[PDB]
């Protein structure tokens, strides 16, 4: 759990994210909780040129290491960590289906039982605010209160979890749910959903196993 | 036909399933008929970390080997084997087009002559029940009575066949049919289909060759 | 131009066809004109297990070599060669967009200037007939009279050209046109097209260069 | 910055363009500003057979080197360079989503904040004219006046930037925006957009960082 190991996992997570087709437009950024702040990807460097040394440490005060420029979206990664103490990693991307659903400004409802992976019966959509602002950070923080992933209106996705592996897995699953919702929405509106009772059973079953 | 050989084929089938784009969300599971029960993939292990030793034997009583946790969806694999004596392998996934059609709760009708690969003029959609339950297992068993593949409402797909190669092939073909049906459904409802007579000719022709 | 060289190109064409995403469902078949008939892919053998020795020679009488089973769809490859003397290679697949357009039973009109690659202002759709029949062969032959590619209703695509490279290229371009037509058809009906005069200019320009 | 180095980058850009799924139909062409004209890809040679020696120099008078045939679309690459003095590289392709939006003859409006990457609140669509003509070149030149990328009606996309890396990046981002617009357009018309004020803030923020 030295800095270098966490740094390699961030980079591996970026590469896997691009392999999976979630990092369309080179827009993603990934962070892990570390010491009193976080390790995040830098702005301006293509994912394929990234080395351990490029990863940027940002303390709990928001001061970043000298000589390195963190992601232009670092502020809501820090909002995530302060809003969800259990989160140890954060994945953000502009994946196409998640983003199209966020353009409609809709939340994804319970069209599939795997929706319970993010914590409840839906995937919320936080209202728009300019990227990098304190206003965007407050919407994200309120949205992650009872959910581990959220859409950002006219923007993309944020997913958090106990480690990078699980955070990537969740981000990917939300992209799948987003694609299921847009494919069926074009056929019928509204789309059939599972009841709240049904989702409460699945949630208990996921706690158990 | 030793256990290890069947175990390698299960793992190879998972990898090919992911290559083909059918294992979106790491949700699939694969089994083969063996001795008095089956060999199935374990729960919790990413497909890329799988080794021969991870494959779990489950007997005809439903008891699994000590120290190994089988897939959380093993029960309907055992339903498949008891309902279709000719089936020797079972592929289950949450492939995006199959699953979107199952969210609409529709069966796929005869829009293409290859529909006859699963046994008749359609691909049914079994009613929803919580994953891992005996109720889900009964719907699956009734649906596979006269068909080799079925959709599961709000869930995904199950396909079975005489060996893994053919079961993967069928699962993939149903995903193609699902995508053909959703693409044309967005344009026109209902979608043009081939008549029952026409499908009976194709079925006879597939018996012959 | 020995048989073995043509045989390797057929196999390479299958592999490239699968790489390009056009051979969904393992359904394609490829042939080249040779001697008094053709060399075609065999039925039953997965594309990745294919070797030079598997390629089947079928003479001008329709008799195939002893001990080898040609594609179940060889008959319309032979129809293509008798209907278009200039064709030296034939690619057939069940590519998803081409096939969805053939399910609607529509021809692809002039939505893009590259439509002229197949010879005119459209891509026709030949009426359905059972696969492998003489009736299907007659529709295909009439459709290829003034066009180098055609859709087959409820079925797929046939493209022909002077060599395999160009035949693959055309097949791929028709899949792109098919996808352009289904994407815009879901938004507006009918889709804007280029005039007949405009296509006549492009056709002359393609003759020139 | 010798000719050979620029030539390798053109070729690498073609390969990456095909990897990204933007060069559907082998239709793209790439150029860089050089000396008194440009270096462009040749017509007729598949991207995978390209070598440094194939790259064609075209002077400021439009005369190309002896013995080499430049792209059939070289003329609007030269229009781009004369219309935008800051552009040093030009990427053109027939990417499927960009092209479908150009078939509708619509401009892409501000559905996402990344729209500001091409310079304003939209991605224009230049009117159709036959490929390779002086009339097409004038529409392209007028469209790139205040934008770094444009759609071409019934045709495709042109993107320009200070170097190939950035030009590819922009072309790819416009394909993502195009796909976001067609996916949401099928659900609702018109699609929600960000206001002009909001885009002016983002534009200033991109100048800053
Ligand atoms: Zn972002
Ligand atoms: Zn399942
Ligand atoms: Zn066929
Ligand atoms: Zn072009």
UniProtKB/TrEMBL annotation, chains A, B, C, D:
The active site is at 73 (proton donor/acceptor). Its cofactor is Zn(2+). Substrate binds at residues 28-29, 43-44, 71-72. NCBIfam families: fucA, PRK08087.1. Gene3D superfamilies: Class II aldolase/adducin N-terminal domain. Coiled coil: none annotated. Pathway: Carbohydrate degradation; L-fucose degradation; L-lactaldehyde and glycerone phosphate from L-fucose: step 3/3. The record marks 113, 131, 209 as: Plays a key role in the stabilization of the transition state and positioning the aldehyde component. This is L-fuculose phosphate aldolase. InterPro entries: Aldolase_class_II_sugar_metab (IPR050197), Aldolase_II/adducin_N (IPR001303), Aldolase_II/adducin_N_sf (IPR036409), FucA (IPR004782). Residues 8-182 form the Class II aldolase/adducin N-terminal domain. It catalyses: L-fuculose 1-phosphate = (S)-lactaldehyde + dihydroxyacetone phosphate. Keywords: Arabinose catabolism, Carbohydrate metabolism, Fucose metabolism, Lyase, Metal-binding, Zinc. Involved in the degradation of L-fucose and D-arabinose. Catalyzes the reversible cleavage of L-fuculose 1-phosphate (Fuc1P) to yield dihydroxyacetone phosphate (DHAP) and L-lactaldehyde. The lineage of its organism: Bacteria, Pseudomonadati, Pseudomonadota, Gammaproteobacteria, Enterobacterales. One of its GO terms (molecular function) is zinc ion binding. Binds 1 zinc ion per subunit. It comes from the Bacteria. GO terms for cellular component: cytosol. Its EC number is 4.1.2.17. Zn(2+) binds at residues 73, 92, 94, 155. One of its GO terms (biological process) is L-fucose catabolic process. The keyword Zinc applies.
């Amino acid at each position: 759990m030295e800095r270098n190991k966490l740094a390699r996992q961030i980079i591996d997570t970026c590469l896997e994210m691009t392999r999976l087709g979630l990092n369309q437009g080179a827009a993603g950024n990934v962070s892990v909780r570390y010491q009193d702040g976080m390790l995040i990807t830098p702005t301006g460097i293509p994912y394929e040129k990234l080395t351990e040394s490029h990863i940027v440490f940002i303390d709990g005060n928001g001061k970043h290491e000298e000589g390195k420029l963190p992601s232009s979206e670092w502020r809501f990664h820090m909002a995530a960590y302060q809003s969800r103490p259990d989160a140890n990693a954060v994945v953000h991307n502009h994946a196409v289906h998640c983003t199209a659903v966020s353009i409609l400004n809709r939340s994804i409802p319970a069209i599939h039982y795997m929706i319970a992976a993010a914590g409840g019966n839906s995937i919320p959509c936080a209202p728009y605010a300019t990227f990098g602002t304190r206003e965007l950070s407050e919407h994200v923080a309120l949205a992650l209160k009872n959910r581990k992933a959220t859409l950002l209106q006219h923007h993309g996705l944020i997913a958090c979890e106990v480690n990078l592996e699980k955070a990537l897995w969740l981000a990917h699953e939300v992209e799948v749910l987003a694609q299921l919702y847009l494919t069926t929405l074009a056929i019928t509106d509204p789309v059939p959903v599972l009841s709240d009772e049904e989702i409460a059973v699945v949630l208990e079953k996921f706690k158990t196993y």
